[PDB]
Design a protein around this ligand. Structure first.
Ligand SMILES: [Mg+2]
Ligand SMILES: [Mn+2]
Ligand SMILES: [Mn+2]
Length: 271
């Protein structure tokens, strides 16, 4: 079955509606699969604070997400986190790597999220998530994820400094035009799999752009990844960074696309 965990506490959010987007996504999953989410954390307004300020502010939410994710990973169900920001994964990825040292993390994101305190241009915690989990810097919530076990999927237009940190650490990158289901399966080999998704990986707007080559990943490419990962091997899935206001038509349309992408994996786990 499925364990649904929903972050609703601020974790460095610089966007206005990602807590609301997480809630609406969770609601759609509850209605479709007959689930009741475990909601963690208290909302707070977005702000452009430095990671050194935002990170301590988020400690209570991160600790609570860590303990909820730990219980789920140790059990028998599919762990599904609907997270406001990628930074929630500073708490979950060290758990994944500890409980499943052989897991491959598919970090599906238009960005690398591999900055350190020394290299970040913007101070944003969300751009430091994968490097933190891999121990390039100390988030205060552990590390232990081998960069050799992390695969960035859909990332593009990466700052050349950050791209060299990624390369030196051994993180593989599969850009959108290479990110077929088979390309992703070849990267995973026989490993159990954790999927982390930042929706900015998706090609914006124009749903049937039939005569142009997309720069981002298409919804069909994400679905093909969820179709291809065997249910027995899937440890869990994180859905992050839907920026859409509560009760907006936009949020209703967005979660319908999300449910279509994740259905192969979630339908199988619910059986
Ligand atoms: Mg499980
Ligand atoms: Mn991200
Ligand atoms: Mn991103």
């Amino acid at each position: 079955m499925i364990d649904l965990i929903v972050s609703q506490g601020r974790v460095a959010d610089r966007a206005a509606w990602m807590i609301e987007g997480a809630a609406r996504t969770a609601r759609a999953l509850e209605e479709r699969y007959g689930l009741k989410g475990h909601y963690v954390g208290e909302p707070a307004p977005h702000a452009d604070d430095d990671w050194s300020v935002a990170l301590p502010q988020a400690r209570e939410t991160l600790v609570a997400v860590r303990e909820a994710a730990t219980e789920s990973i140790k059990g028998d169900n599919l762990t599904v986190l609907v997270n406001n920001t990628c930074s929630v994964s500073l708490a979950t990825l060290p758990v994944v790597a500890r409980e499943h040292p052989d897991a491959v993390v598919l970090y599906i994101d238009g960005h690398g999220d591999f900055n350190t305190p020394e290299t970040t241009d913007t101070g944003y915690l969300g751009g430091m998530v994968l490097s933190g989990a891999c121990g390039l810097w100390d988030s205060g919530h552990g590390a232990g994820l081998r960069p050799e076990q992390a695969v960035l999927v859909g990332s593009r237009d990466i700052d050349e400094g950050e791209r060299e940190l990624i390369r030196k650490a051994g993180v593989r990158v599969i850009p959108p035009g290479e990110a077929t289901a088979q390309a992703v399966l070849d990267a995973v080999k026989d490993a159990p799999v954790w999927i982390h998704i930042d929706w900015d990986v998706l090609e914006p707007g124009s749903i049937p752009a039939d005569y142009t080559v997309p720069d981002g990943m298409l919804p069909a490419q994400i679905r093909a990844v969820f179709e291809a990962i065997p249910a027995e091997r899937l440890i869990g899935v994180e859905l992050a960074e839907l920026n859409a206001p509560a009760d907006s038509e936009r949020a209703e349309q967005a979660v319908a696309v999300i449910l279509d992408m994740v259905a192969p994996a979630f339908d199988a786990a619910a059986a």
